[PDB]
Design a binder for this molecule. Sequence first.
Ligand SMILES: OC[C@H]1O[C@@H](O)[C@H](O)[C@@H](O)[C@@H]1O
Ligand SMILES: OC[C@H]1O[C@@H](O)[C@H](O)[C@@H](O)[C@@H]1O
Ligand SMILES: OC[C@H]1O[C@@H](O)[C@H](O)[C@@H](O)[C@@H]1O
Ligand SMILES: OC[C@H]1O[C@@H](O)[C@H](O)[C@@H](O)[C@@H]1O
Ligand SMILES: OC[C@H]1O[C@@H](O)[C@H](O)[C@@H](O)[C@@H]1O
Ligand SMILES: OC[C@H]1O[C@@H](O)[C@H](O)[C@@H](O)[C@@H]1O
Ligand SMILES: OC[C@H]1O[C@@H](O)[C@H](O)[C@@H](O)[C@@H]1O
Ligand SMILES: OC[C@H]1O[C@@H](O)[C@H](O)[C@@H](O)[C@@H]1O
Ligand SMILES: OC[C@H]1O[C@@H](O)[C@H](O)[C@@H](O)[C@@H]1O
Ligand SMILES: OC[C@H]1O[C@H](O)[C@H](O)[C@@H](O)[C@@H]1O
Ligand SMILES: [Ca+2]
Length: 1032
Amino acid sequence: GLRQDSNGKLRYFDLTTGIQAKGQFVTIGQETYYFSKDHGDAQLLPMVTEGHYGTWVYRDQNNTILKGLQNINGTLQFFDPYTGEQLKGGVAKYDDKLFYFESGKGNLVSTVAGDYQDGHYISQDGQTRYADKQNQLVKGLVTVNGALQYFDNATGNQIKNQQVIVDGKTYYFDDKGNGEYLFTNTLDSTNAFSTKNVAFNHDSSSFDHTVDGFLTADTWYRPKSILANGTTWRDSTDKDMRPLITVWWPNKNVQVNYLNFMKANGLLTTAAQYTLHSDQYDLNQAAQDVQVAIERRIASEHGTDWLQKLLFESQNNNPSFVKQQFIWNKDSEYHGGGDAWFQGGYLKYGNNPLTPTTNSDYRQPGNAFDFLLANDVDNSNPVVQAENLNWLHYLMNFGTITAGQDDANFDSIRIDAVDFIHNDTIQRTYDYLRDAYQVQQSEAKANQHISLVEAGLDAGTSTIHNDALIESNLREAATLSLTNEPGKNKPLTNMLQDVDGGTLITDHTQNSTENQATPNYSIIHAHDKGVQEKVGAAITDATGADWTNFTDEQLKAGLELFYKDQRATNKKYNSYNIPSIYALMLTNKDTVPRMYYGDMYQDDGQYMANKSIYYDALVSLMTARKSYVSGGQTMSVDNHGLLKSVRFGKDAMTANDLGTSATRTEGLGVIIGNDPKLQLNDSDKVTLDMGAAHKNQKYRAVILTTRDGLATFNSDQAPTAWTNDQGTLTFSNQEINGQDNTQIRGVANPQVSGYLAVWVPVGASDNQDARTAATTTENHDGKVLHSNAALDSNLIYEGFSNFQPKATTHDELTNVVIAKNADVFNNWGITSFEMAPQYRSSGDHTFLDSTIDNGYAFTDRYDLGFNTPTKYGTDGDLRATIQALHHANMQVMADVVDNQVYNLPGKEVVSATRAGVYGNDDATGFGTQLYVTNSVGGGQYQEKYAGQYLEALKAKYPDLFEGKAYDYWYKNYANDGSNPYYTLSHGDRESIPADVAIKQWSAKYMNGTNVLGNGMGYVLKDWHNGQYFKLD
Ligand SMILES: OC[C@H]1O[C@@H](O)[C@H](O)[C@@H](O)[C@@H]1O
Ligand SMILES: OC[C@H]1O[C@@H](O)[C@H](O)[C@@H](O)[C@@H]1O
Ligand SMILES: OC[C@H]1O[C@@H](O)[C@H](O)[C@@H](O)[C@@H]1O
Ligand SMILES: OC[C@H]1O[C@@H](O)[C@H](O)[C@@H](O)[C@@H]1O
Ligand SMILES: OC[C@H]1O[C@@H](O)[C@H](O)[C@@H](O)[C@@H]1O
Ligand SMILES: OC[C@H]1O[C@@H](O)[C@H](O)[C@@H](O)[C@@H]1O
Ligand SMILES: OC[C@H]1O[C@@H](O)[C@H](O)[C@@H](O)[C@@H]1O
Ligand SMILES: OC[C@H]1O[C@@H](O)[C@H](O)[C@@H](O)[C@@H]1O
Ligand SMILES: OC[C@H]1O[C@@H](O)[C@H](O)[C@@H](O)[C@@H]1O
Ligand SMILES: OC[C@H]1O[C@H](O)[C@H](O)[C@@H](O)[C@@H]1O
Ligand SMILES: [Ca+2]
């Protein structure tokens, strides 16, 4: 061990190997020594005990900042010789050599071979290498321009994206070759003591807390022999179980910490200080002394329950011993990053020869995105694709199946997170609807099953044949030009055309055609879009909580503030110009608008109890839409910055068309301003060109801007204005004919920040309906939907909000109120009622969705409220709602969530790598490891209904079970800064079976999971050679 030479100087020889320590540190008993690299001569580093960290620097009991190398509390640290700043993630020179200090705590962990700042990277043989000042290849572990790196010793190739062991330390090098220290390895005990700790055998009965035959950090085991009472070696009985981490450790960091943890909990008495620089022999020896105290205490306690608590459970509000270790906690999982959109990011499943039950031949994303949250479903898998059809069929026949109630079935779907599931499942979904409802035959069939997706033109399987509507760019455009406070709005010229990354959806300026635009829906808000983050902000502000987890009382208080703010003229959290934006949505041509519940009602009340301040204006616009809105469209922005939008009325596509007798009392004009300080000169005129069908005609207001808000009129009893002989209405800063609120001027109030007026022609009959019926004309162009008058005649209603409170009675339940109010929706002209997703919430609080239980986060996707209600009602309440809506002549939309499942309690082991939403591998210290995942479960109703309809579907619609070639649009981003562009890709979906049900999920049917925080080394292996422990 420690020897003196003939000169009296001390030298050190490794206890296990005999090798002399030169140019390295060693901890002996309680002292830490350095041994010179030349002669191997000892040098005491005096322990620094008393003092503190501050500013980072370290001071002594004398309030003095320390400098250079220091031995602080069993760690060696370095502090700049001048500034005294602590080094972390870098090298310092000592004894004319280089040592690396890890980035966490700044502990000295290793020697580095050289420091290079005067070389050049080069490529040779498609590798990167580095050539030093003398043009020589650099080898080994080095720093280059201040970055730890490693080059293969034989070739000089820079290692990238791998873990590497160098001199018994393990490091990770990223995608750019930049390195970080992970842990220090155990050198190795060989002794007779340890050979009695070896496992009795490798059978499953000798181990517990195992998963799929793998060992975990929590595993207890039966050894060959037990040192009873700390004195007598005996044979183990089947009832002798001891923890594996009392006799074995994955790395030196854990073994050192374990010994220290046992010192602090009074199971090991020594003045010896244990560090990363302690000799392995001594560490091993000390662990054996701990066994002694443990066995002695087991005998005393007649049991092992104290040991369980000591090692594996929290203590004095501290994490357990296990959860204090890097490889067994989230720190070794490297959460976060720009692509980690929710839940700290993802783990992508792979294959391993030892995990045959979780391996997969699929797991291709088949779309732009892959991961989002919770357990991501592998919708490329044929068996999954079949189970997607089964679930889809269940929802489209939900009343039939659950109660033999044929008028209680969903008619249409929303594909949630469409870009996050494989295109084959999306195309197959569309063939199902083709086969069941013949939507491709004619617009009559298509418009009875209006479906939509959560995406724009990027949903290429949805645009290629317009099987469903995509979202227009209205939301975004309006967010630039109208939603903002005074001074922060852009000009309204961006509202003239609806454009998605440079591609045109429709142009409002001079729209006189049909079947040209991409079938789309326009919105401003949705349960998620433009709401949850602004409500989140007000909760956080009013209380303190984070926007995805908080109490119902905190929620309440946040909403109190949210609505006081929504009702004010000046708005910190809320959108400006909401009525105006709706005005545009409800009058624009070539769109199906979708109204948002939360723009008409307030979540500080039960469902539909508390009207919003916008209620009356949005009613008046819906009402006018049905009565008046048809024909072509013009739009322009005048030199005062006012947007002028006109619809001509049925049968008139342009300002010059004379129309028909229907045209006279149809059409309307909209005038919008986003500037509340607008004032016109006395001589200025604002003109709306109503068209040749509307010469010399009396008009009346639907909306007028007042000082305090908006006046709304749902009959011809309203202020009036006349067109001239050309069909032009003319406004100015004066009242028309002595009528208040007919002037144009900027106003700032709770409902408008700028200006809004809507005018319609006088003299419409009480029953006037401007809408156009779909024809049974056969389509020939291969498109399902077509953007024309008939499709524009539709109107969608998104019938929920995330932040509705829980119902306190049956009559307060959402679905009960909906049913009771069915006629109201029809009166407003709603043709499609988009219901919330009706699946029972997992209730796990791991995301916003499972905290307010909106129905997006669920375990059992067939459970739509049986026995006990969801947030919205029971299964009986849901049937009653679907029936009421149908009887009030509306379709009802099922929100189809194929992307993920939550809270699967059953455990499995699968290979995992860190990954972002794109399905891209992240380059992290975690690397690729076997991982214990929460991947098995589902629930009663899945067990009951999954796979049950497949044989019947196969008999009835064989084509869906076959493979099939298909086309779709692919959105290409150009790196050169210009706009994205679309190319025609081809797909070939696989055939799929009808005879394998997914009664419960498991990992072989999943792409991955959100990070769980178990750590890179929770599944136990030998880190010297990388082999997993696996039982028989
Ligand atoms: O745990 C904190 C840090 O520990 C360091 O030794 C590692 O190099 C880092 O990757 C890690 O973030
Ligand atoms: O040679 C004695 C000891 O030297 C220390 O510097 C190393 O960290 C140990 O692994 C080794 O056992
Ligand atoms: O785990 C429970 C049992 O474990 C054995 O190793 C001990 O000798 C018993 O006294 C103890 O009750
Ligand atoms: O409390 C003692 C018991 O703890 C459990 O958690 C372990 O799994 C058992 O093997 C052990 O016998
Ligand atoms: O793999 C298919 C996907 O790849 C992405 O690169 C494109 O942006 C998508 O439009 C396409 O669906
Ligand atoms: O499924 C997770 C998320 O996906 C989105 O597609 C939904 O609209 C959100 O409300 C949801 O929180
Ligand atoms: O390119 C922007 C597009 O992105 C999509 O995610 C949105 O749903 C569209 O409203 C928008 O037009
Ligand atoms: O709105 C629900 C409808 O369901 C029907 O079966 C009832 O018999 C009607 O009275 C009712 O109009
Ligand atoms: O209730 C659904 C309604 O949707 C419309 O778009 C259909 O084309 C109408 O025939 C139907 O009355
Ligand atoms: O220029 C610095 C970069 O050059 C090279 O591309 C290397 O691969 C990378 O290690 C380095 O950071
Ligand atoms: Ca996915």
